[PDB]
Design a protein around this ligand. Sequence first.
Ligand code: 4LU
Ligand code: 4LU
Ligand code: 4LU
Ligand code: 4LU
Ligand code: 4LU
Ligand code: 4LU
Ligand code: 4LU
Ligand code: 4LU
Lengths: 207, 207, 207, 207, 207, 207, 207, 207
Amino acid sequence: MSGPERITLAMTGASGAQYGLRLLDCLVQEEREVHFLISKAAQLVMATETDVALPAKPQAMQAFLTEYCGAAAGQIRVFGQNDWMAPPASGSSAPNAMVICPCSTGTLSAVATGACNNLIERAADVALKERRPLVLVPREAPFSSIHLENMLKLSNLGAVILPAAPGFYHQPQSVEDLVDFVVARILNTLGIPQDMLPRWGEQHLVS
Amino acid sequence: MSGPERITLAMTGASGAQYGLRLLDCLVQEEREVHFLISKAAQLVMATETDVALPAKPQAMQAFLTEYCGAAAGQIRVFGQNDWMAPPASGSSAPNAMVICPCSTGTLSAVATGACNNLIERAADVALKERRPLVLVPREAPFSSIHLENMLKLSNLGAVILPAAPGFYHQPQSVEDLVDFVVARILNTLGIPQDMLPRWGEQHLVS
Amino acid sequence: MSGPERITLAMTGASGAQYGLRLLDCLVQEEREVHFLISKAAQLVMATETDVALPAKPQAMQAFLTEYCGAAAGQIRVFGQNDWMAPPASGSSAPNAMVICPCSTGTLSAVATGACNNLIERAADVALKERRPLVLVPREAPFSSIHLENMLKLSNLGAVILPAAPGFYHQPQSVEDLVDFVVARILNTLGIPQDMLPRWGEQHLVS
Amino acid sequence: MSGPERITLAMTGASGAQYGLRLLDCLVQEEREVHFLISKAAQLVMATETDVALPAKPQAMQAFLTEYCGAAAGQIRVFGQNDWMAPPASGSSAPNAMVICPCSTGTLSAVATGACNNLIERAADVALKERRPLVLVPREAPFSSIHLENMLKLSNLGAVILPAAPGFYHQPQSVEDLVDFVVARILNTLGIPQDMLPRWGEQHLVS
Amino acid sequence: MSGPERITLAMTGASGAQYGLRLLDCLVQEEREVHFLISKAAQLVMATETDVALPAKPQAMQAFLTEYCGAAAGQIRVFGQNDWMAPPASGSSAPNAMVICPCSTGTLSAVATGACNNLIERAADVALKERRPLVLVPREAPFSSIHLENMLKLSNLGAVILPAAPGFYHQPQSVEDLVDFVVARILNTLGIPQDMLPRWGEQHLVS
Amino acid sequence: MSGPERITLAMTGASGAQYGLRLLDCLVQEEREVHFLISKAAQLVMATETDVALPAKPQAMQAFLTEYCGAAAGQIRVFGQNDWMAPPASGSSAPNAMVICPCSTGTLSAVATGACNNLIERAADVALKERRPLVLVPREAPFSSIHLENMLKLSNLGAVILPAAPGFYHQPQSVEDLVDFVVARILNTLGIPQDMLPRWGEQHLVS
Amino acid sequence: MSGPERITLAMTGASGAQYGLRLLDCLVQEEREVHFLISKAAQLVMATETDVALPAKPQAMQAFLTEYCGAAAGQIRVFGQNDWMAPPASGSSAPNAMVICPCSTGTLSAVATGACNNLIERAADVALKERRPLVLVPREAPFSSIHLENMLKLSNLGAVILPAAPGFYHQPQSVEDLVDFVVARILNTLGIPQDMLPRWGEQHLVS
Amino acid sequence: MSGPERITLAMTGASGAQYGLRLLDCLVQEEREVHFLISKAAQLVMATETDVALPAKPQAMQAFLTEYCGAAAGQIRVFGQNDWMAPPASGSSAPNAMVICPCSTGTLSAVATGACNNLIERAADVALKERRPLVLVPREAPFSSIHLENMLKLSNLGAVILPAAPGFYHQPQSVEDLVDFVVARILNTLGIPQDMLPRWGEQHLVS
Ligand SMILES: Cc1cc2c3c(c1C)C(C)(C)CC=[N+]3c1c([nH]c(=O)[nH]c1=O)N2C[C@H](O)[C@H](O)[C@H](O)COP(=O)(O)O
Ligand SMILES: Cc1cc2c3c(c1C)C(C)(C)CC=[N+]3c1c([nH]c(=O)[nH]c1=O)N2C[C@H](O)[C@H](O)[C@H](O)COP(=O)(O)O
Ligand SMILES: Cc1cc2c3c(c1C)C(C)(C)CC=[N+]3c1c([nH]c(=O)[nH]c1=O)N2C[C@H](O)[C@H](O)[C@H](O)COP(=O)(O)O
Ligand SMILES: Cc1cc2c3c(c1C)C(C)(C)CC=[N+]3c1c([nH]c(=O)[nH]c1=O)N2C[C@H](O)[C@H](O)[C@H](O)COP(=O)(O)O
Ligand SMILES: Cc1cc2c3c(c1C)C(C)(C)CC=[N+]3c1c([nH]c(=O)[nH]c1=O)N2C[C@H](O)[C@H](O)[C@H](O)COP(=O)(O)O
Ligand SMILES: Cc1cc2c3c(c1C)C(C)(C)CC=[N+]3c1c([nH]c(=O)[nH]c1=O)N2C[C@H](O)[C@H](O)[C@H](O)COP(=O)(O)O
Ligand SMILES: Cc1cc2c3c(c1C)C(C)(C)CC=[N+]3c1c([nH]c(=O)[nH]c1=O)N2C[C@H](O)[C@H](O)[C@H](O)COP(=O)(O)O
Ligand SMILES: Cc1cc2c3c(c1C)C(C)(C)CC=[N+]3c1c([nH]c(=O)[nH]c1=O)N2C[C@H](O)[C@H](O)[C@H](O)COP(=O)(O)O
């Protein structure tokens, strides 16, 4: 397989719950192991803007998502926001790529300043210190200078700042096709196969 | 009327031609005068990703768009990329708000460094020096540190960096509803009435 | 009316509860709509240093303050610290000016770094990104370099840093007159009429 | 004795003459020697906002203040604004702590940039170069970014930026009690005994 | 006595609970008064990596530690994480030196940015603003650039960054001897007598 | 094999000779080729704080260490401090990972500023310019701001700053177990198998 | 006694050997213990510009200087440039103030960047990390921007930059009186009694 | 002639009046035209530390100095501190080199920030803007970070920062020989012949 075997997927409280669910689905279909993390604000967002009835506590959540995605047993592990015994909490853990999608402006700030106030924030802190991949998917508009300075600092340290800014150049016919654009971008960044977004110009030889 | 009477609307070569067309339509419906500017790369984008057959040269383009939008005569003025005699070229012009939507990473850079290589770039330069409103709508992903540093510098000087990052919290049913989200945000930033995106929490009194 | 119709007034855990109460009273007397926010530490401060018995929960608090100020029904809206459905949480809300008075060093930091950990902090973050007025009233002494760097960054972005530093040049006779000095300054900054602090030198024509 | 035997107390032209007079009184009561310096603008402030009739020239001023405070002969030395032969002008002088209270934004600037235009400004310059204590008590509101950058630079070099921002948590009953709060803070910073502001939590053992 | 009479000792959630316990023991043996603070994550660390059964709540914790160390009554005061009435919360408190040992990357960040979210973080903020001693003992590896920038900013402001990096040059025979090395370093920094680590080269006169 | 086939291991004059010896032993056991470099101060440290009688000159040193570690012939190459003909001196050499363990504050400085005064310093300079892995293991306490600024600059350029700060969370029973903690961290950073430090939380599925 | 009991006095290769000799003499007369360090370039300077025939090696040098100054036995300790076992090499040593007089531009640079290439440079590095006094006495003219940036960085960290720039305001009659001016300044900075330079304005009471 | 025909020589209020007088004498002996400027504080310094009885007003001062130096008529022009009609006030003047000797910390600051408060300060401002030579001769000790940052900024812009720091390597026998060292350095910097300080190593061919 190309790309990482294990991905820490954190969802935080920005608009765009559909991006996180769709990415979790694609990762499951590519037979990757997923350590799933979700913030209390992200649970509110998912309730407000989708019809997914996600259980509150980690054990019921893991059952639910395993079903929702057609996953194998043990494929999705769910960890709570203060579970410091979970792999993402420590750099001595086995190597994982991490994606925060969506990434709230609050979580962006926490990762930029090193706040480490919960498992999501600490797991990003660990990714940076161990130089493991870290992809942040913000959804906000306008971006203030506070937002931008946080993104610049993280990008300069090697995090990939991938905003939820879909392109329109693959004939999108629905909301799902825009969601897939961004998910494909994330998958390309991780080095994981995807077939939702073609390789640009791959058949063009000259002109 | 609340908001500016005249808006310079520049389209540049990022994905998202639909955002620029829809904004031009809303501005026409709110009876504003629009100075329309379009880059050569943006004409290619519009050809690639829409079915709008926009004429190449300014006089035919102005006729075309006046028709496309149901505009009054003289309501849309179109200026070419080297027309230094057009109002946006000089700070001695009458006051306009300016929006670059979509805003390519190339145009972002040119405005940040002050390159002024064509009328779009000079008009932004003039907006900044006269402290008139300037809203930039980038569409790119990932954003590199070069992109981010250009956005931060412009935001620190008072430009509004409004990425084409639609939210999902008003029950979007189509691509058009995501386009409208971003257009509504732009209109709110200019202070121009819109009824596509409700005012958040306006009916919530307590809890 | 001159000045904003709606003001988000946040109280946070610095000394100076009287400044926040007096400002809320003046805003009510000028017929403005107030979105009132209060932190858990600020509730402790108000208990420690005043005799106002403010109810704990938002609905009882709103009744209490409506009475305390002689307000009209609906004039004061109170929102809890995690009520992400309230208007100040989103930039899609209708435009409000925001004042944080008093502003703790913790809240100053959170706004400077973009932490957005509760509604007060997120509402400031939204004010900055939408370029709506934001006035911060710190009360601390000494100010360390951490405090000062947070204030400088926010002032450079356009926040008004208005410390609770009353002047003595209008013959103050009581603690209430010093409180009124600072409140008048805040009201002048918002553009809202006040008659507690005269206009300096308004009758002086020459010398 | 704890704290310095000699204090250079400079008064400059910000509101808050009462803070400077009260501090001079407390220092005299603690049997310290005071080198008293006062700017021409501060003399105007004292005339405008108090009823103290301070003589203009140094010899008469020294007599006046010696009386006003109940000081011993020689306890208060007064030096004029161009008296380069006075101890505070040179780093070869005996060690003194310096307090500028109130500290105008002009004097803040002069000390930050090293202007040394009069004895007050040079004495601060000497304090910094000899690493002797320097406490600045500004009274201004709002603080601009110019003010804040001057304060940050001085704080980073080890000056104590102590704004005239009294707290309300010791049951203040009058203007005099707010003045005493700030004076007590200054005295605590110098390490000089005071009994106006109790030691916080000194009797609290647990909870 | 040389060194401070009162030390605020805060334990936070990094590996190295033994360093904090041993320092508390040495401070008790040198007859100092200790204000003991402990974070919720540090309680988890102590449970995971030692056999000390520390009670959860402050009153039982104070009894426990008084016993564990052979302390006098009142010698160890324990304060909870939201006890804003305890001495370390305010700069008006009596002077204490503060040591955070171990110091988590989260607590490092909070002190660097001024977050003040709990008593530990506020007490450090107060130490810096009052220019009282502040010693931070991080335990992490690798240190990222976020960690390092937080440490540099605090060191530039006068905090002592003392990582839990024991030396091997005093013939260490056990884990306890490495723990004692770091504790001795902390005690030397505070100016408090210790006899675990000899004075280097004290008997060497020439060569 | 996972990880690099060749490692340049440099020892410099900080406390912690045991870390460098143990790492050299683990690298030999994993069948890697090691280019061993040692400074004159590090030879003094090893004499002072261990019982290893390391020969002075490179040929005798190579024989000695080959024996000490059970290495194959040619597995350990030793190069002197001015041997500019050795592979690590030039970027045209075959690719190696480099570890400086322990890393003195002097060697840290030299690498940060680019001094290149001996083979160790030049080999690090070459690692950075060719973007090959570079891991620095400092042992010092306190770290001054000079130390920290040197570490930050190198970390920002992609060096891994891994201080000799062992954790206590794998039940350490001896000095050797603390040494192994840090060595395991270094091996994890290089991507080389180790079984001294388990993978955190690897068996934890939920909670 | 006021001031430190032990002073590390380092001489380095700038013009002004007489300043270093005279300071060593005054320190001996004030009964302080001196750890004397001298660079190879400073030995050349002393040969070139004085008639002091200083022995080359430390044991003979210590005898020589003990005689030259009228010191007690053991009062002057001399350490060679690579004697890492001497007290100044380690922060675990007993506390000393350090003066580098004269301070070459090379030694200034080494201390600023943390090079630690010999005992003088390491002893300064240790002074900074332990926050012990460090006074640098450069003699160079012009100062380039490289010199100035090195001095600024060290001054910002708390080193005292005291150039060999004598004043003329105490009626100097000879070269010795100019040398004494600078030596007195150094002694004042250390807090050690001296009677060569009077206290400025000490008898001036008013004007 | 080598070097400039006209030199603006400004004296300001630092110790070292003898340097300025001696330079004026050497410039007269080399037949240069001198525009002489002197501050009010420098007149006080000259009264305090020399026996030169310099007349107060410019016309009498010019007569006096013409005599003191053996100058030709018109060779020394003296201009008062507010004489904006004198050549140094404007960049349209004929080209002159400027030397401020001695240069007070106040004048250093004024030139660094561009204050231009009197003819000396404006003449330096003009030198910098026209890129004419500007040499500043400070006399202060210690130099604070404020001093150093002012010197660094001016040196980075091309001013020569030449402190009054004489060397001892040309067998100085008196105060006059130290004064001549610095004057020779200034003359070398201007490119004007001098024979007080030999050319170093001019007769050394090898070793
Ligand atoms: C609950 C809530 C919070 C929104 C939010 C919404 C809700 C329902 C929406 C969907 C109705 C409107 C859009 N919101 C966004 C948002 N923050 C942000 O960066 N982008 C957003 O798009 N916020 C704020 C965000 O959740 C917070 O500031 C939380 O403190 C973040 O905490 P977290 O990082 O731990 O998830
Ligand atoms: C023509 C072309 C150019 C794209 C582009 C596309 C096409 C059709 C798409 C739609 C197929 C794929 C997306 N593209 C984007 C893009 N630049 C950018 O910032 N965001 C984009 O989304 N570029 C590049 C951009 O047009 C250039 O770098 C031009 O030089 C910009 O010139 P302009 O600012 O004057 O318009
Ligand atoms: C409860 C409490 C907290 C004080 C405080 C007091 C109390 C009663 C006083 C009145 C007795 C003494 C003064 N205090 C101030 C203070 N922080 C600050 O910036 N200025 C203050 O004047 N603090 C600290 C502050 O409340 C905190 O650090 C909280 O974490 C801030 O949380 P908040 O921003 O959410 O309100
Ligand atoms: C005379 C005068 C000047 C005030 C002033 C007042 C008066 C009476 C008051 C009391 C009526 C209103 C408040 N004022 C303040 C003030 N500057 C400042 O930083 N804070 C102030 O509170 N200023 C300005 C200040 O005095 C100047 O800018 C002087 O140039 C400062 O010179 P100084 O530093 O040498 O004293
Ligand atoms: C509970 C827990 C948290 C560890 C931790 C461990 C556990 C048991 C160990 C011992 C098993 C592994 C090492 N850990 C460290 C750590 N943070 C850190 O900076 N260094 C550490 O050595 N963390 C994270 C840290 O506790 C957090 O990010 C908390 O949010 C910090 O909160 P605090 O500052 O309020 O204590
Ligand atoms: C010889 C010697 C030098 C120690 C030292 C010791 C000795 C025996 C010890 C073990 C007794 C005490 C601790 N020391 C350390 C140290 N430098 C440092 O960064 N950390 C240290 O732990 N130093 C200083 C260091 O060796 C120097 O400054 C050398 O110039 C570094 O040269 P190098 O980088 O080429 O090895
Ligand atoms: C030997 C030598 C070196 C002089 C020197 C002289 C000699 C005799 C003089 C006395 C004839 C002329 C003046 N010199 C000075 C000088 N460096 C400097 O900063 N200021 C000086 O005044 N240098 C250079 C300085 O010694 C070096 O650059 C050494 O490398 C410094 O090494 P050190 O810091 O270890 O002493
Ligand atoms: C009058 C006076 C002022 C001294 C001074 C002296 C006197 C007699 C001495 C000779 C007795 C002691 C040394 N002093 C120096 C000094 N400033 C400085 O940078 N270096 C000095 O060496 N000062 C201060 C300096 O003159 C001022 O701060 C003036 O405001 C500077 O104004 P100027 O730049 O316009 O000359």
